[PDB]
């Protein structure tokens, strides 16, 4: 379904553009939400990827593959040994899974994606920085 | 500097100047107030280095 902003009584005061609480649409897929939900339930595992399993009108089910980064086989297996690196801790919380990357616009590259490359926030910061060099 | 405090104007009817005052009633947040900000604080964005051909 669509999202309903959590504003008490439905009132979002202020400028009229920022009114409107039902019918808003989530910025992340429900696949990304499914992976963020299993990250919080199990913060001891690292999330690799997820896939659609089934859907109904009420709910959509997705299965998420999670890795124990402290098992002997995983640590010594060169193929999955990168999940054990500390920088891959709760990757879903930093938008680093495939679904999160889609929602951040990182599946697109080239024209269309040139203001969302290091990150949307980082591009704005690199564009709006005032250089103020010494020998200006 | 001078902006770390919480001061608000006391108002217009307490027989006091409208400058911002701390909870006790102490002048604050102004060039003319002790402990207040510089009116125009000095900044490292000044061009320290000139240019020559």
């Amino acid at each position: 379904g669509g999202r309903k902003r959590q504003c008490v009584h439905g009132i979002s005061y202020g400028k009229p553009r920022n009114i409107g609480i039902v019918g808003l649409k989530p910025s992340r897929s429900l696949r990304a939400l499914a992976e963020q939900k299993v990250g919080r339930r199990l913060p001891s595992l690292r999330v690799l990827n997820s896939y659609w399993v089934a859907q109904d009108g009420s709910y959509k089910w997705y299965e998420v593959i999670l890795i124990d980064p402290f098992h002997p086989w995983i640590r010594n297996d060169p193929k999955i040994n990168w999940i054990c690196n500390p920088v891959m801790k709760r990757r879903e919380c930093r938008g680093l899974t495939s679904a999160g990357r889609k929602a951040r616009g990182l599946h697109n590259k080239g024209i269309g994606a040139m203001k969302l490359r290091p990150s949307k926030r980082a591009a704005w910061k690199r564009n709006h920085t005032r250089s103020l060099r010494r020998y200006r | 500097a001078g902006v770390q405090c919480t001061a608000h104007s006391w108002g217009p009817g307490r027989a006091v100047a409208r400058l911002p005052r701390k909870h006790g009633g102490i002048g604050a947040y102004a060039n003319f107030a002790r402990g207040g900000h510089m009116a125009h604080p000095t900044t490292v964005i000044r061009r320290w280095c000139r240019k020559v051909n």
């Binding site: 910061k125 709006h128 920085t129 005032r130 103020l132 010494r134 | 490292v44 964005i45």
Partner: peptide, 30 residues
């Protein structure tokens, strides 16, 4: 004012709050 070319300078953003949008080059000789 009178005969002047209208400035195409955008107004400073996030000047006292938010991300630091001003960079300084005193680290250049280092």
């Amino acid at each position: 004012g009178r005969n002047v070319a209208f400035s195409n300078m955008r107004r400073y953003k996030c000047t006292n709050k938010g991300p630091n949008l001003i960079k300084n080059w005193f680290n250049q000789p280092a």
